[PDB]
């Protein structure tokens, strides 16, 4: 049970996202970004929005920026609960997953 080599085989969830986006409008492509790191949904939206705004050379309003950061940090809590409580479950600590998934 000592690991000599690891060969991660991926693509079992490759779903031609980047090609599909070229057949969609910029707005139509945004939901694809929620479904990438589907544990940090609003964070992925923000990156795409920032890129498009930069190309558009526009600026989001101030209140929207504060809302983005607020929900970006809520989204960080959502991700770090899953990361911590599924790291623990895989290691055998089942209980914390249930405590924190209620949050």
């Amino acid at each position: 049970e000592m690991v000599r080599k690891c060969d991660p085989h991926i693509g079992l969830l490759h779903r031609g996202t980047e090609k599909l986006i070229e057949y969609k409008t910029y707005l139509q492509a945004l939901p694809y970004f929620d479904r990438l790191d589907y544990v940090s949904m609003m964070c992925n939206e923000q990156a795409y929005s920032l890129a498009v705004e930069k190309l558009l050379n526009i600026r989001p309003p101030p209140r929207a920026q504060w809302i983005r950061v607020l929900f970006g940090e809520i989204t960080r809590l959502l991700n770090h609960i899953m990361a911590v409580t599924t790291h623990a479950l895989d290691i055998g600590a089942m209980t914390p997953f249930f405590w924190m998934f209620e949050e």
């Binding site: 190309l55 558009l56 050379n57 526009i58 600026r59 309003p61 209620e102 949050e103």
Partner: protein, 95 residues
């Protein structure tokens, strides 16, 4: 909230924290599910004068990239000034 006084002590002692102050089950302190109607503000461009779009058109202010060089005793430079060393937090430097 419905826990008897003995049970509150037992679970407070075992955990070690006053759990009744910060309960994890929401009760009546949440917001009402029916709220008064809103009235939202308007943007800076909701003006009837001095609001020509040509003065507030970001897309049209975007220019093609500058061509610094093309095949068609200076001091050395860095991409940007060297970064500033971070400072330890004064709230709690060591966890």
């Amino acid at each position: 909230a419905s826990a008897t006084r003995f049970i509150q002590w037992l679970r407070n002692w075992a955990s070690g924290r006053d759990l009744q102050a910060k309960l994890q089950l929401r009760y009546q302190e949440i917001s009402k599910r029916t709220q008064p109607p809103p009235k939202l503000p308007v943007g800076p461009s909701h003006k009837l004068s001095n609001n020509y779009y040509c003065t507030r058109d970001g897309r049209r202010e975007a220019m093609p990239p500058s061509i610094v060089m093309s095949s068609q005793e200076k001091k050395a430079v860095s991409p940007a000034p060297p970064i500033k060393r971070w400072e330890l937090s004064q709230d709690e430097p060591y966890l």
